[PDB]
Amino acid sequence: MRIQHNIAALNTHRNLAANNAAASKNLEKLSSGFKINRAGDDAAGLAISEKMRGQI
């Protein structure tokens, strides 16, 4: 309730970690120049890109 646990700081830490992760993802997308670097980014579209690259 008072000392042993400070829940506001925990919530703030969570949100801070999430924001840092999102900024890191954006940095990856900007440095790479591609919007899809992993399949977790977009599954339907990775396959399409690979087939289109083969066709090109």
Added chain:
Amino acid sequence: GTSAENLTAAESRIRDTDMAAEMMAFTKNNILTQAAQSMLAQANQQPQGVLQLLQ
């Protein structure tokens, strides 16, 4: 003479390069290099949490 000209054309098309396409690719790669440079300059500044500790 005819055969030499034809084979010269063939060899040119095989081995020689088109200046315009390589110019395009080189400009593209330079722009990407600059973008990555700026991104790295930002990423190096991103981890600054010294204000947690001191005040």
